[PDB]
Amino acid sequence: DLLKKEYTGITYISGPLLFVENAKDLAYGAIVDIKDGTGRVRGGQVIEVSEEYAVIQVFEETTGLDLATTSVSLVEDVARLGVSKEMLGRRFNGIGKPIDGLPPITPEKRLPITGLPLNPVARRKPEQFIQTGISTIDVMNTLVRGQKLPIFSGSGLPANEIAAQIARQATVRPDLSGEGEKEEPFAVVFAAMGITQRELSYFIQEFERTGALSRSVLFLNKADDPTIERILTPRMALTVAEYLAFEHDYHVLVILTDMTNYCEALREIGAAREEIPGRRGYPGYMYTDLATIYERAGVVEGKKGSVTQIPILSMPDDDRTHPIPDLTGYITEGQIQLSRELHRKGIYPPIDPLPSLSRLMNNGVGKGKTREDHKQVSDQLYSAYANGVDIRKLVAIIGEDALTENDRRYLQFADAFERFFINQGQQNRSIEESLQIAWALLSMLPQGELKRISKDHIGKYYGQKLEEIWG
Amino acid sequence: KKEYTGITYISGPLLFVENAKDLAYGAIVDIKDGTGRVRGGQVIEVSEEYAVIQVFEETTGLDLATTSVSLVEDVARLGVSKEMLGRRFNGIGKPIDGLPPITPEKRLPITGLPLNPVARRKPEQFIQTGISTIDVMNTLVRGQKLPIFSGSGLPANEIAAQIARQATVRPDLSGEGEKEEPFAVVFAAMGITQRELSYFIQEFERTGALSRSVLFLNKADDPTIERILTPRMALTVAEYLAFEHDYHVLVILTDMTNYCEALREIGAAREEIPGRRGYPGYMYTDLATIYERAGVVEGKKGSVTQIPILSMPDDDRTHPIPDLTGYITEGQIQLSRELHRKGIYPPIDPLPSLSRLMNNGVGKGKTREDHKQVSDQLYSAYANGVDIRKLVAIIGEDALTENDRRYLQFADAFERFFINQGQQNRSIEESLQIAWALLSMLPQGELKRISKDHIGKYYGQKLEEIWGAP
Amino acid sequence: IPGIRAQIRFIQQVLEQREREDTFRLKRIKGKIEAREAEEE
Amino acid sequence: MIQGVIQKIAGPAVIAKGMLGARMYDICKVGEEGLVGEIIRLDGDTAFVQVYEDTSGLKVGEPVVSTGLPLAVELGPGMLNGIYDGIQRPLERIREKTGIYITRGVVVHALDREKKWAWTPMVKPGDEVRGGMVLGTVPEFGFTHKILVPPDVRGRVKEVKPAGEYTVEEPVVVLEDGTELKMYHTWPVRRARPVQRKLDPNTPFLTGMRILDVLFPVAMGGTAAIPGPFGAGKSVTQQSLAKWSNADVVVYVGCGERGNEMTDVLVEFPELTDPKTGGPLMHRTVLIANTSNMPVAAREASIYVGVTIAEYFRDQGFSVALMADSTSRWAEALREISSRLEEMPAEEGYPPYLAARLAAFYERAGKVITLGGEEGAVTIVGAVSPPGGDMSEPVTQSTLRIVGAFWRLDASLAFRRHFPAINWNGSYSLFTSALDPWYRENVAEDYPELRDAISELLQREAGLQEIVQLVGPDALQDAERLVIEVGRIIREDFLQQNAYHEVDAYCSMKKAYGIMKMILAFYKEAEAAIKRGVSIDEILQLPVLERIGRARYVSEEEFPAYFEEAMKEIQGAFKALA
Amino acid sequence: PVQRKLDPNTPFLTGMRILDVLFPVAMGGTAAIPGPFGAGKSVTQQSLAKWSNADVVVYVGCGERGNEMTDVLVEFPELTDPKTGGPLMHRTVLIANTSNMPVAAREASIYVGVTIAEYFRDQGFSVALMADSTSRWAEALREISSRLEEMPAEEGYPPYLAARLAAFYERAGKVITLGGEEGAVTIVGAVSP
Amino acid sequence: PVQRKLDPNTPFLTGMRILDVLFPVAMGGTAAIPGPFGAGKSVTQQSLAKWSNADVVVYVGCGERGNEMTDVLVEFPELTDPKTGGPLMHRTVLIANTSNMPVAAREASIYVGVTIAEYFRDQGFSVALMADSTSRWAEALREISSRLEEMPAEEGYPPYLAARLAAFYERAGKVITLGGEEGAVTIVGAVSP
Ligand SMILES: Nc1ncnc2c1ncn2[C@@H]1O[C@H](COP(=O)(O)OP(=O)(O)OP(=O)(O)O)[C@@H](O)[C@H]1O
């Protein structure tokens, strides 16, 4: 435990891998230190071991290594990260080292970065409504505390802005929930993999403006940093998040900037090891890896904290059938999918409601949680918007002049919906204002066309005009 | 006799056995485990270093220390007899009906030989399936390879059973004719479920068709190699009967999509890089060795006729299975989901169906002189009726001419009384009568494709002859 | 109709290319494993 | 016992040397902590072991021991109301021993060995016993659980315990040959439990959903597959079947899916009521949860454990429903395994034997005469998760060739929040013709004809939708617009169902018959009106359509009166039009 | 071998006005015809054989169906030579293959036919070679290449399909034989996509 | 290395109305200009070099036409620096690895150009870096990985292609130099899909 065991006998350095011969006493998954001839130390992890040799994945670049002056030493058998309450207000890199000038943190515990699966019996039901301030999320794709709700983005779409806005505006509404008023904010664990300087400066300035750096832990893996380092960043971030939530009663919001980059690192390692790959060259176990990451959210019986995840990924050619978005959606509890068509029209946030989803929305809406009309109003909005898009496809065939009055009304509804309900800029809307706007838009259709809403709610809320809100 | 115990590798479906240079390529072997259970397998590679055995079923209890391999036979053979009629087998030829095993007249290699092209002769006589849409519009000729293209949820099994129950030859219709000619049906079912197995057993037993049939039934949970062997054994029996006992043999191969999936699986199990769309690069040759085992030979009274049945994977005729099958076969009978969901049975759609050899097995001296023109006219009239049916939805019935309206009525009558025969057994004369009754709805002289003699002779029948039995 | 034909051609090309790439990968991996078996069994 | 040492560790795969004599697919204890593994390859003196747990921290040279037996399930009293892992570890006991996390190397008995059971013998000394006979009985949550002779056991009874309270370890019956039969036995999980004969299904499996029970029925011993992309509502459908089906016992297998879906069942079912018994719903339920971040090799185990438990409850003479949350995850686990083994893939990387394994699993379903002469049944509903929503994937296509019913889900409908979101055109059932006698005897004499009329209407609407997409809906003639409108009425008032409603979450067959009859009568009267020259606009404004549209929400007790009023009102409304 | 390959300056008269006028083929030329079903390709090929100015005819069936091959083998014997009135088979060499005959034979069929054609050319005759279903020959080639474990190109065909077809078709031509006489081989292929 | 990375706040004026107005680039930003052959990549980049408001231009001809390098060499010495007033060539560094020059040197050319640009930034200059085609750099990496016997990702390229591209593009930025002055490197990247 206190004795240093070195392994000369490196027989191969190529790409991110390194073979060492007589290392039969290196555990599977152990962390190692690779010392070069000039005394520089670089890290790696044992990913295969046999009597013949051990395969090490190097976390840095391999420049300057030689098969004569390099040695591998054992750091620890199981990859662990020292955690403490004092991680708040600190900035670390992809392997959890300080990058802000302060000294290293004194651990209260060292936890395995891989973690362990939460027992399903131990889990709670995620039920607390979070008010993001974005109407397309609050009304139609509600976010509940304990949920894993990613953002499916494009190349030039504003996903970082949406994530920053959600962090800035997200709050629970104890007044509606019937719970005693309490002012516990969100702690934000922010993990960036392959993030450019432009996006990072945006996020950092936004947090500094909001004053959220004091209650944030940042694991930053930039785009000029080693790619294989990205394998550990999400796991370190989620180790810290789980620790804070389920040992210190924090309500943690975890932002994972770009999961496409993580998948790129995974594919790199898979190809180096000559594994038989799956789709588009990605490893066949990518579902399991992504589940090891995403399933570290939720809420636990008998504990007050929570972990909420909002991964952000870029669908490569705006392609939802690409393996990364596809597997993610199969793992996560919904998705908020942006649209380039709305973005080009100038609509912000450019959230397209039809392809978005929130699995747990029914858990945290309705009488005693948000308002008794919420679910039916969301259903009615979906139906009306779908009819509008269909009539848009129809005008290209028949021509506008041939439309019926109801078809024209649905066209007008679709336009107004996009321009007033989805387009809200950087404004923070309460669920009450969002439902008011939704009802104003629904009042543009005849009261008998609202078949998903009960007549009690139609009596109570139908009628108000949009001009009363604006203009 | 000799037992090989030098087993040095077991992985998935394969086991390697050393010091086994005495095993022929493609020999069938028995695998005995420590518990005493006996499995089966086939030699798929032999070298001076070891032989590779593909194991039927599962390699669960096998160990390298107690397993022993023995030779059953060098070449897969099937003992055949005329006593195989009325009997049910399991895909490798083992009885599954509980009656005693058959004593064979001879044992034959299941992968028979290719027929000499110069010993073949033209198909010239027809098989009456009892189904009007086939007998009249897509005739089946003795020696033909006529597949049924089905879909996911369509009643292909019922149609197969109906043809098996009704199929017959018509010696009386062939000029002077003959008193009787033997007829047999060989039914190969591959990858079927328990429900389908029970349905087939009951169908063959209730109507008595079992007495003139041989059934090779392979379940979906049986070994894949048995699926591969089932059609070969069926056709070996068919060739035996036809070309050594002058039988007229009809072969129904119930799911060739299942056969091709099994072929893909076995190819992957022998470490062969898949060809187009995952299927083996030799799929064409294998499907040919199966399909091409039908025909009519010069100097022999018998014949072999095949009806493969395929479920087009996603209604795609461009899928490799149906593409290759069309390349090898001589037409296709296409089922339709529109007709099925409208209640019509058998849901055979005449428009996309064709029998390439129909013209050589219909006409004077075989069926009736009016057959070809009646078929052509029915096709044209039905196509016009369907087009007018789409046109009415837009321009209404008033904007149609009287002839367009008559075609509109004829199309519905055709669907209701010609296609929709239920579980009836219609002789060719009854089907031709129904066809003439339907054509009588159109005005004489609008039947361009029929000579005036036939019109004079048969035109004028009344729909009441079939109105009471849709 | 020409637009649909162009889309069909494009999708066919993409799918065939993906199949070709996967096949090349399998051949490469199996060849390398065979070489490894030859070198060290 | 066969013993050896680790030679190589690559992820969940361990190569152990010195294992000569080890058998294929036998369980092995790996490492110093005895991690449960399985032998999947034998190569000279080496064996390829799949660890059912995480292998991080293991070292070369650690011992590997073989149990000499394949994966087996403990079958007997103590499973209902229980939640298990993939290899039948109770999760409540893991929760007590471990904290809120699952740790490796926990050994816990499947059945509780300290709970006592009220044994009532049903054999007496000198009685012959054969596999599957009933020796006695035990109460469990309103079921008369019956102890069965293990299938491969024979002999004559020497002594029988008197009626009393004993643990499941008690040798309740002793045979002259010396065999001591306890309340439970062990069965290899990959062997189908034998039955006397399999019977042709003739009774429906009522899920409470109109579209499935009417248009796409599944029989009691049948198999259904429900494929779809994420968001289309597979989990909601499976849970509705768990809540509302007419099966005596429900087995729920969470193969490699979200853990919140298991939490939902655990939290909610205890508060719900069994449709027939009346007691708590969780008392008729067995959960097998192997979530997505739990060991990959345990997914195959979860599927086969579930099917074995279901076959046991069938051997007891029950009707059992088995729900597989995703067979796609089972297939992906197989693919991961094969890639680790460096096998030759087929199609999208799957092992060649995937189709055979699916077929073997789905052929364990059915209605049977048990070895005891009773009648039990297993109905399997498996969900498929094609990548990209592509139904041309190998898994979906291989399922499509062995199942009886195919409930295709549509992304377009799920995007509009139209649930159940079944693609009518792409769905089918092979059980309709076999269930007609039952429908005539138990729903209504003309139910089959009404169902067929609905189907013909839907096919006509599908046919005219092409013209509608070509020329728009207003260009159609009156009769065709009526067909389009009645198809829409069917879609919104009959096929649409609200799982979260208090009444509409469940529908009886008679309520479905009533709604169908309403819609057909309306269609006939509208056709007659149009032939007499009534505008469509005036037809679609008739208020009786609102009654037809609200029929879904009428409680089961009030529905008959509502239906009679509506049948009178339709005739009145189309008579008043004159 | 030949001594010289001459130019395409003389016509190959099929006897059919449409081909002989609108779309002529020269002596030593090459033509391709697609075979749809029901288009009467068989009668057209038979008339080319009957009435062409070719002295000898080589008909290669490379991978046909069994019944199409039987049709060919039962019809040609009964055809009559317009020049002599004797059986047309007396100036015809026929190569017959079926789909279920060895793939090597189906692959070598066109080569055997062309070699025979060139022999009769070197004797100083005009020979018409008709290869029915070169698509089936390409299928045989694709299968052979798969069995040799070669990297496929395009729809699974080997990357040398075009070159093999070119080498085959370029054996056609009008030549001066090594013996100093004029002889020709004219190839008419068929394609069935 | 640099002291600090700044936020781009001034425009990279190009001389093209469309790029300057609708789709601008900041003085230390990155742009990609992909296009099919014949669309105007080379003309656009040469115009960037002739008219841009950068102090220094490093123009990297990675695996492209040699006539383009000759065109630059011949023409620029006669044009005038828009701001300095001297000859345009005097503000330009040319790195040329044409298409028929060795393949592996394409990667070296990219890295050499970006390092020189960083150097001139470190002197306090605003530097424009034009990469004539990063597609040819990707092709070189694919070739070398073929020789290494590595396993490819999509379309044969090595899986670390995105990492290399990212590392190359992240060297752009407005910065505070270690000497305390303000520098900037702007990268425009041509891709030839
Ligand atoms: N020149 C012709 N003069 C008169 N009738 C002809 C002529 N050419 C063809 N036909 C007739 O047209 C028919 C064409 O269709 P058919 O299906 O019979 O042709 P096929 O030769 O069997 O088919 P394929 O195109 O596959 O060779 C020929 O069978 C023959 O009946």
| CB contact (8 A) between residue A274 and residue C18 | no
Helices F66-75 & F41-51, crossing angle to 10 degrees?
30
- Is there a domain that residue B470 lies in? no
Give me ligand 1 centre to Cα B299, in Å: 28
Taking the CA of residue B276 and the nearest CA in chain E, the distance in Å comes to 6
Contact present, F154 and F98 (Cβ < 8 Å): no
CB-CB neighbors (< 8 A) of A271 in chain F: 150-153, 158-159
Tell me the residue range of the domain where A298 lies: 4-462
**Closest-CA residue to A254 (of A302, A293, A290, A201):** A293
3-class DSSP string for D38-72 = EEEEEECCEEEEEECCCCCCCCCCCEEEECCCCCE
Helices D559-576 & D509-531, crossing angle to 10 degrees?
0
| CB contact (8 A) between residue B274 and residue C30 | no
- Is there a domain that residue B469 lies in? no
| Contacts made by residues A274-278, CB under 8 angstroms, sequence distance 24+ | A274/C29, A274/C32, A274/F151, A275/D339, A276/C25, A276/C26, A276/C29, A276/D338, A276/D339, A276/D342, A276/D345, A276/D349, A277/C25, A277/D349, A277/F151, A278/A323, A278/D335, A278/D348, A278/D349
| CB contact (8 A) between residue B394 and residue D353 | no
Which residues in B219-234 are b (16+ Cβ under 10 Å) and which e?
Answer: bbbbbbbbbbbbbbbb
CA distance A319 to D482: 39
Place of tokens 């390298």: B64
Tell me how far apart the terminal alpha carbons of chain A are, to the nearest angstrom. Answer: 73
- Is there a domain that residue B464 lies in? no
Residues 6+ apart with CB under 8 A from D170: D119, D161, D182, D183
Amino acid in position A470: W
Q: What is the DSSP string of A174-230?
A: HHHHTSPP-----EEEEEEEEE-HHHHHHHHHHHHHHT-GGGEEEEEEETTS-SGGG
Search chain D and give the residue with CA nearest C27: D344
**Closest atom, ligand 1, to C-alpha of E37:** 26
| Bridge partners, B3 (sequence order) | B70
- Is there a domain that residue A471 lies in? no
Structure tokens, D81: 């109301």
Taking the CA of residue E108 and the nearest CA in chain B, the distance in Å comes to 16
| Bridge partners, A219 (sequence order) | A92, A191
| Bridge partners, F5 (sequence order) | F175
CB-CB neighbors (< 8 A) of A276 in chain D: 338-339, 342, 345, 349
CB-CB neighbors (< 8 A) of D28 in chain B: none
Phi, psi (5° rounding) for residue B258? -65, -40
Taking the CA of residue C23 and the nearest CA in chain A, the distance in Å comes to 11
Please state the domain count of chain B: 1
Distance of CA E95 to the CA centre of its chain: 10
CA distance F150 to C24: 12
- Is there a domain that residue A34 lies in? yes
Amino acid in position E21: V
Contact present, B322 and B312 (Cβ < 8 Å): yes
Place of tokens 């008193």: B179
CA distance D175 to D557: 54
CB within 6 Å of ligand 1 — which residues?
E 35, 37-43
**Closest-CA residue to E182 (of E121, E129, E127, E128):** E121
**Strand D3-10 to strand D13-17: parallel, antiparallel, or no bridges (unpaired)?**
antiparallel
Structure tokens, F103: 């393949």
CA distance A53 to D9: 11
- Is there a domain that residue B468 lies in? no
Residues 6+ apart with CB under 8 A from D564: none
**Strand B68-73 to strand D173-175: parallel, antiparallel, or no bridges (unpaired)?**
unpaired
CA distance D381 to D363: 12
CA distance D243 to D274: 8
Residues 6+ apart with CB under 8 A from F163: A227, A264, A268
Tell me the three state secondary structure of residue B241: helix
Residues 6+ apart with CB under 8 A from B402: none
**Strand B183-192 to strand B77-80: parallel, antiparallel, or no bridges (unpaired)?**
unpaired
Structure tokens, D335: 């693919």
**Closest-CA residue to D58 (of A7, A23, A78, A2):** A78
Tell me the three state secondary structure of residue B303: strand
| CB contact (8 A) between residue F148 and residue A264 | no
**Closest-CA residue to A294 (of A340, A259, A252):** A259
DSSP element (H, E) containing A12: strand A10-14
Structure tokens, F177: 């130099």
CB-CB neighbors (< 8 A) of E157 in chain B: none
CA distance A127 to A362: 9
Search chain D and give the residue with CA nearest A302: D100
Distance of CA A179 to the CA centre of its chain: 28
CA distance B78 to B229: 11
| Bridge partners, A54 (sequence order) | A20, A49
F38: left (phi over 0), alpha (psi -120 to 50) or beta: left
Q: What residue ranges in B74-221 does DSSP mark as E strands? A: 77-80, 87-89, 106-109, 126-128, 140-141, 148-150, 168-169, 183-192, 213-219
Q: What is the DSSP string of F102-145?
A: -STHHHHHHHHHHHHHHHHHHTT-EEEEEES-HHHHHHHHHHHH
Which residues in D213-222 are b (16+ Cβ under 10 Å) and which e?
Answer: bbbbbbbbbb
Cis peptide before A349 (omega within 30 of 0): yes
**Closest-CA residue to A383 (of A350, A413, A420):** A413
Which residues in B237-256 are b (16+ Cβ under 10 Å) and which e?
Answer: bbbbbbbeeebbbbbbbbbb
Structure tokens, D53: 């747990």
CA distance A80 to D433: 62
CA distance A60 to A16: 8
Taking the alpha carbons of F185, F186, F192, F193 in that order, is the dihedral positive or negative? positive
CA distance B286 to B260: 9
Do you know the residue count of chain E?
193
Contact present, D299 and D333 (Cβ < 8 Å): yes
**Strand A216-222 to strand A90-93: parallel, antiparallel, or no bridges (unpaired)?**
parallel
Amino acid in position B240: Y
Contact present, B110 and B80 (Cβ < 8 Å): no
Residue among E16, E43, E188 to mutate when testing ligand 1 (max atoms within 8 A of CB): E43
| Bridge partners, D249 (sequence order) | D320
CA distance F151 to A362: 46
Contact present, F115 and F127 (Cβ < 8 Å): no
Search chain D and give the residue with CA nearest B193: D402
**Closest-CA residue to A271 (of A260, A261, A256, A281):** A281
Tell me the three state secondary structure of residue D359: helix
Residues 6+ apart with CB under 8 A from D123: D129, D133, D134, D135, D136, D157, D160, D173
**Closest-CA residue to A140 (of A445, A377, A309):** A377
CA distance D490 to D184: 51
CA distance D478 to B238: 57
Give me ligand 1 centre to Cα A172, in Å: 81
Place of tokens 């000729």: B141
D245: left (phi over 0), alpha (psi -120 to 50) or beta: beta
Contact present, B295 and B116 (Cβ < 8 Å): no
The Cα angle at residue A284 between residues A278 and A287, in degrees rounded to 5:
120
Structure tokens, A436: 């008011």
Q: Whose CA is nearest to atom 30 of ligand 1?
A: E40
Structure tokens, D240: 């509705």
Closest residue to B264, CB basis, from D346, D366, D427: D346
Phi, psi (5° rounding) for residue D207? -90, -10
- Burial of residue A302 (CB within 10 Å: 0-12, 13-18, 19+) is exposed
Q: Whose CA is nearest to atom 3 of ligand 1?
A: E43
3-state helix, strand, coil in chain D (%, to 5): 35, 25, 40
CA distance D214 to D427: 12
Give me ligand 1 centre to Cα E46, in Å: 11
Cα–Cα distance list, E117 to B188, E33, E141, E181, E187 (Å)? 46, 20, 22, 15, 10
- Is there a domain that residue A329 lies in? yes
Give me ligand 1 centre to Cα E189, in Å: 18
Sheet holding A357-358, edge to edge: A90-93, A216-222, A187-195, A251-256, A306-314, A151-153, A334-337, A357-358
Tell me the three state secondary structure of residue A76: strand
Give me ligand 1 centre to Cα A225, in Å: 73
CA distance B400 to B394: 11
Q: To what resolution in angstroms was this structure determined?
A: 2.5
Contact present, A151 and A311 (Cβ < 8 Å): yes
Does E96 lie at the interface with B, CB-CB under 8 angstroms? yes
Residues 6+ apart with CB under 8 A from D550: none
Q: Whose CA is nearest to atom 6 of ligand 1?
A: E40
B395: left (phi over 0), alpha (psi -120 to 50) or beta: alpha
**Closest-CA residue to B466 (of B428, B437, B429):** B437
Tell me how far apart the terminal alpha carbons of chain D are, to the nearest angstrom. Answer: 91
Cis peptide before D420 (omega within 30 of 0): yes
Give me ligand 1 centre to Cα E111, in Å: 29
Contact present, C4 and C11 (Cβ < 8 Å): no
Does F173 lie at the interface with A, CB-CB under 8 angstroms? yes
Closest residue to F170, CB basis, from A15, A201, A223: A223
Structure tokens, B332: 């296709």
Taking the CA of residue B357 and the nearest CA in chain E, the distance in Å comes to 9
The Cα angle at residue A26 between residues A24 and A31, in degrees rounded to 5:
155
Touching E (3+ Cβ pairs <8 A), the chains are B, C
The Cα angle at residue D492 between residues D488 and D497, in degrees rounded to 5:
155
This entry's atomic model was obtained through cryo-EM
Tell me how far apart the terminal alpha carbons of chain E are, to the nearest angstrom. Answer: 33
Cα–Cα distance list, B434 to B259, B416, B418, E127 (Å)? 38, 11, 7, 54
Phi, psi (5° rounding) for residue A217? -120, 125
Q: Whose CA is nearest to atom 28 of ligand 1?
A: E40
Cis peptide before B346 (omega within 30 of 0): yes
Residues 6+ apart with CB under 8 A from D71: D25, D27, D38, D87, D188, D189, D190, D301, D304
| CB contact (8 A) between residue B271 and residue C19 | no
Give me ligand 1 centre to Cα E44, in Å: 8
Q: What is the DSSP string of B327-370?
A: HHSSEEEEB-HHHHHTT-SS-B-STT-EETTGGGSSBTTBS-TT
Number of neighbours of residue D556 by Cβ within 10 angstroms: 12
Cα–Cα distance list, F143 to A264, A268, B21, B204, F104 (Å)? 20, 17, 45, 65, 8
CA distance A373 to D336: 46
**Strand D35-43 to strand B7-11: parallel, antiparallel, or no bridges (unpaired)?**
antiparallel
Structure tokens, B354: 């064709």
Taking the CA of residue B383 and the nearest CA in chain E, the distance in Å comes to 19
Total CB pairs under 8 A between chain B and D? 146
Which DSSP letter does residue B313 get? Answer: T
- Is there a domain that residue B356 lies in? yes
CB-CB neighbors (< 8 A) of C23 in chain B: 273-274
Taking the CA of residue C30 and the nearest CA in chain A, the distance in Å comes to 10
Give me ligand 1 centre to Cα A293, in Å: 68
The Cα angle at residue D532 between residues D530 and D533, in degrees rounded to 5:
65
CB-CB neighbors (< 8 A) of A280 in chain C: 18
